[PDB]
């Protein structure tokens, strides 16, 4: 009856769910805007924001904890150097959701999930 | 159809 | 929690070693016993020098539980093994003259006075 529980199952086991959250968070860090379904973006708000929260302070061990997630060197290289000193003033809530119609393949609620960016 | 199967083995009632 | 077909160790030196609880006495349709409730047991193993033989069907009282007994302060007392004291079926008056292991304070009411008097701890 899931009283006071959080965490969307998304019709997948925890291995595939964690792996696709890893890959989708890496894609959102790399491309700065992606287009997916709505609850995946809702749960990716609980994934990307702790990554940026860990990326607030640059050190030796924080790079290893940010490499323990996203399993990639280019993603942690874009972290702590580009996103770090640019999201320094804002405290939390670095993402943004945009509902964009429905997909023509299966009628699913679509959403552009992005960061507060692209003023380059 | 071509093949119509043998029906279900019924209740004994013997 | 002592229910039917439960193997228990004998706390006193009456002679039996392993007993089997066959029915929780007191009240119909009762699942399991409590702190100092009366149970009916049979004897599965005994010493040759015991006062009772193997196969005697008699009443006993539980003194130590692995489920634990609850003091009214909020604490629980869990023992590492079930234990019982054998009783003589119309007047309780236990057979063993020395009792090994501690007991619980809620056993002390007017009929188990000899058990807690012979108890070495608590």
């Amino acid at each position: 009856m899931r009283h006071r529980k959080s965490g969307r199952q998304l019709n997948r086991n925890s291995s595939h769910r964690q792996a696709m959250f890893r890959n989708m968070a890496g894609s959102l860090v790399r491309h700065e805007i992606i287009k997916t379904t709505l609850p995946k973006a809702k749960e990716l708000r609980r994934v990307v924001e702790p990554l940026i929260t860990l990326a607030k302070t640059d050190s030796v061990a924080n790079r290893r904890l940010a490499f323990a997630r996203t399993r990639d060197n280019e993603i942690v290289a874009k972290l702590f150097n580009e996103l770090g000193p640019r999201f320094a003033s804002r405290a939390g809530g670095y993402t943004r959701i945009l509902k964009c119609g429905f997909r023509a393949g299966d009628n699913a609620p679509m959403a552009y999930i992005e960061l507060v960016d692209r003023s380059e | 159809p071509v093949y119509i199967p043998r029906p279900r083995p019924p209740h004994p009632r013997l | 929690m002592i229910q039917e077909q439960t193997m228990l160790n004998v706390a006193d030196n009456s002679g039996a070693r392993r007993v089997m609880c066959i029915k929780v006495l007191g009240g119909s349709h009762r699942r399991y016993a409590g702190v100092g409730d009366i149970i009916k047991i049979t004897i599965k193993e005994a010493i040759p020098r015991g006062k009772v033989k193997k196969g005697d069907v008699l009443k006993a009282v539980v003194v130590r539980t692995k489920k634990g007994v609850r003091r009214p302060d909020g604490s629980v007392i869990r023992f590492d093994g079930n234990a019982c004291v054998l009783l003589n079926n119309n007047s309780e008056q236990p057979i063993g003259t020395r009792i090994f292991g501690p007991v619980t304070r809620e056993l002390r009411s007017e009929k188990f006075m000899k058990i807690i008097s012979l108890a070495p701890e608590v």
Binding site: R96, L98, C100, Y112, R118 | - | -
Partner: protein
Amino acid sequence: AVQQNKPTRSKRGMRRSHDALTAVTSLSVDKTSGEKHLRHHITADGYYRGRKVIAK
């Protein structure tokens, strides 16, 4: 599972009486462009609350 007799056209119509789809009929007007869009959804060109939020 197996029915006794078939239902009617009337029973089918009274069953499909609650199958009528509901239209939203609540299309909004953008502040800058004025294009038609749904509630809390962006337009076809990416307009939302006047700001170019898609930047594309």
